[PDB]
Amino acid sequence: VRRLLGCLGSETRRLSLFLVLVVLSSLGEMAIPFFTGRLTDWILQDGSADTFTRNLTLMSILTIASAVLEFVGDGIYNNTMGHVHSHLQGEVFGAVLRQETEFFQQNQTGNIMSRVTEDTSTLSDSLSENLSLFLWYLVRGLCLLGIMLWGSVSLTMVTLITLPLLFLLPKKVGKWYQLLEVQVRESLAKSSQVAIEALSAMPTVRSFANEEGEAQKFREKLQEIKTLNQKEAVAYAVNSWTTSISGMLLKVGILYIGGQLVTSGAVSSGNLVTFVLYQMQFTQAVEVLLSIYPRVQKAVGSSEKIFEYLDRGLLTPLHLEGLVQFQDVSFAYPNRPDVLVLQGLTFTLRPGEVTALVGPNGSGKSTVAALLQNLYQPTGGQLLLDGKPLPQYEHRYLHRQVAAVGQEPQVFGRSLQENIAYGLTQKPTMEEITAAAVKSGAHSFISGLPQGYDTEVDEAGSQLSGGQRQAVALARALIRKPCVLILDDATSALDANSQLQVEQLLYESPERYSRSVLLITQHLSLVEQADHILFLEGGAIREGGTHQQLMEKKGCYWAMVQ
Template sequence: MAMCVFACLFLCVDVCVVLSLGVARLLVQHAFVTMWVGGLLRWGLLLLVTCYYPDSPAWMRSFEGFQTVTVHCLLYPAYGTLLWACGRSTVELFWGWQTWQGVSKHFISSSLWSITCCVTCGVTSGEMAIPYYTGKITDWIMKEDEPEAFSNAIKIMSILTIMSAVFEFLCDLIYNITMSLIHTSIQKQVFECVLKQEVAFFDHTSTGEIVSRITTDTNTMSESLSEELNILIWYSMRLLFLYGFMLLLSVRLSIFTVLGLPIIWIIPEFSGRFLQGHSVKVQDSLAKANKVATETFSCMKTVKSFANEDGETERYRMHLEATYALNKVEAAAYTASTWTNSMSNLALKVSILYYGGQLVAGRDVSSGDLVAFVLYELQFSSALEALISYYPHVKKAIGASEKIFEYVDRKPDIPPEGTLAPDALEGHVRFNNVTFAYPSRPGENILKGACLELKPGKITALVGPSDGGKSTIVRLLDRFYHPQSGEILLDGKPLQSYREQYLHEKISVVAQEPMLFARSITENIRYGKEDVTDEEVEAAAKLAHAHKFISDFPKGYDTDTGEKGSKVSGGQRQRIAIARALIRRPQILVLDDATSDLDTESEHMVYQALLRDSSRRTVLLITHRASGAQIAEHVLFLRAGEVVEQGTHDDLVRKNGAYAEFLRQQNTTFHRYTDAEAADLPLA
């Protein structure tokens, strides 16, 4: 019997210390410090129990016993340190530190936190006194004396009940407001962190996945944690007050109750770990389904033109079925966890009733104290059961948050930002032996020692076949990517030495397929330059030859362009984008085939506007048309990532080289073969 008592005491102390250290890891950022200090503290407490408990086994007090306790306490810290030394991720190993750090940072920053704790203490302390006075009433009924004690107990119970109800209302109100602030703050933080990532991040991460993380995952985490944190705070305070009253009534019954707790705590820990890992799989599967839906809706015209509605529906159904299969496993695991928790709690209650009856028979406690203790124990078990039942939900929320806080903690792969922001910028650009390959295709060089120069106040045309690297030069100039070798100079200084915001204010790029936001035309032209006047917006539209068609709209400049500019034509979209670039008064203007959807007359008028205004800025014109190259003062012919020829349009035509051949191919008319000619053609 003495051996069993020692084993229960040893296990109880060990579990309580482990859980206390788990809470400490949630509050202290330095995980390795808490892990090792906690391990040493655990080792010391267990050695004290072993050495000073009179009935501890002899072998436990020997060197072998000390060695066993040492391995038992320090194995986990050593394992975590080994993982860290090997370069493995140890963040979620330390009790889901990412999630709790991110949530508690916003929670503690709110001034409502202290108010919530105070009100919670008031609620719990008021409710906890009610069973105590119930026991006093029971003693009065059993003894039938002290009539004033009965009335006093009733009065106190009534007052405490009213106070508890009022405090509970205030606590719920304050808590819900606080959690709403937390949800908004986390979602805003994730959105801001995603915007700070480098462009390469968006190349390998789909839009659907990002949207799923920002919306679905943050909602899942916030909704779960808002409920679970409420229960955690509420029932944790209840447990403290309940156990305090239980100790006042009977120390032996209280110790007996605690001895059964390790079994109840161990079961949800194992089930919680499984649910946490499975929750990550569910969120990943859901993100893939959202990716399909987002991609389908954004390309709806293409889907309909190819009559592939059934194909996209089938793709989406397959992803949903995969998510459903994972959800079934998760539901089964959660049900099994809940059932085992309920059975273990039931066994504990029966044991306490039996032992309490023995104490009453031996007159160690009164009948009233036993009634009060049983009421406290029922509430204690209920609170503990609630905490345990929601523990898998907490693990699920931690699993859902892993991807969220991966985005928050991810450091953009961007070189240190420069400090240059001169008041005057000439706009002289030079590429010196630039070699570049996209991060998604590291072995395929798009630019191979490219050398080119853009002179201030000049229009330079960049011409060449598709996949030659023309758009890549624009992306490097806009500092979306960084070359593997060579250098890009702006006014003789490295491009990375300039402040990024300053650089994007001085460089404006208009792509072949510009993106417009689902806002008015005025808001699209004014985008990123909110301080410009309506007169400046109209002037920029006139320069881009867009004022006439905008004025023809019923709502004029207030016309909504639709998602990605779907409510305007391709040519109108390009001219609005050109106006958006011109209103910034950039020192360097890049038109990446930005007039491809314009008719000849509109293109001519846009070029005339550029010629009138080109003396004040550097213009890079990427084009496939001879008309665009003819207005340029300097032409660069780019092929296979190298500048093959350069000079004026007329000089390159007279040279009759690669540029002239490219123009001839552009002007070659389609020839329809006769049946006899077609018969002589080689088969593909």
């Protein structure tokens, strides 16, 4: 549709020059048969050597210039359309990465974004060659016809009228062959199905000793298919015969009408020779050009789906107050709106404090974590970050102000000195990076590598341990220096030293006074040491207070602890 024209319109300034070059090249190449016929008539007319060598030099110059202009035009068009292909790939990747978490909540869909862009790439690539080829021959074909119209209209009318009779008759004939091929393939599939049915039941057929029976049944099916094979052979023979005689008999008629014209004195023999050569070249060009339309059609059909897929706050505070509050905060996943992970939860995390969530697994802690990070908006209620809405804050400001380590953080597939600072707009200092590594306890893991922090880390954390991965995630979080930290699974499976460092950074760190931290993990020792311990189950808060207060209240937290 108009989408392809709109996306190609950026290069019109060079595409018009490309069209000028392509028509110049098409005009230049066809000088060989014309001069061949003219010089043959000239030498049969006892011509002069001066009028000769001039024509030889002129034809050589014209053909060389045509080849050079064709090369230059091809280079220009390839440059422009490769540029537009790269731009389209970048734009479609940006669009597919700009989709919301609701569209990407299905991890099993992770295949198709892995494919689509790649397919888009080769789609353009295919279309690229096709478009050029088609347009090339189109202009060439037209140019040939023009000179043929300048040769003899009364004879080129014959080769214009004949062409549908030789280009549509094979298309009409081949339907019979295609239908017979379809029937043959269906019968072959049925026979193979019978063979597979016999093959899958080997225990019982060997228990009854009936291999010869199954062989006989397969032979019977093949004997049934033999007749369809015979009819297929006959149809293909007829199609080959008609597609040969349609093009072969025209070369007789053109020479007959040319002989009639030449005897009539309308044209000379050299004009007939030039025509014959031009008709051969024109037939070749039209024959190739008619073979490009279905591929272009399937390419644009896939591009329509590609573009259909393409179709589907700015608050910047200077400092963070570290206040988080909820007002009837309920959240529901888009895939399962009938079941709400949280139902009007009410929990507050003041600056310089710790909130420890205790409850059954799957109660909706991840929903609260996503709501606090503005990844997905809640189904109900309002989440206030220091009295302001979470989605109202800008994405960069919220990401640089409130930071967290997920339940299953993944090490970035880059260098450890880069994977510990992924997404940082400003590059951290070397001393700052060393301090961040030392503070989080990741200094021991980083120093163990032969190349230090600059050593590359493979995909999916192959070269990094799980405790090392947790240490790297906590180091990235600490290097972010966020005021809001959702410590989720920070040291659940890590070493005791890592857990002690996490507890010291949560409680005894100098920055803990001006930083708000909410903890959702299995650290039992750190759970009892929190300033506030809240019990959440089924999306609702059942208990809240200190560990001693929770134990004295005999609530859900007391039962879980005991």
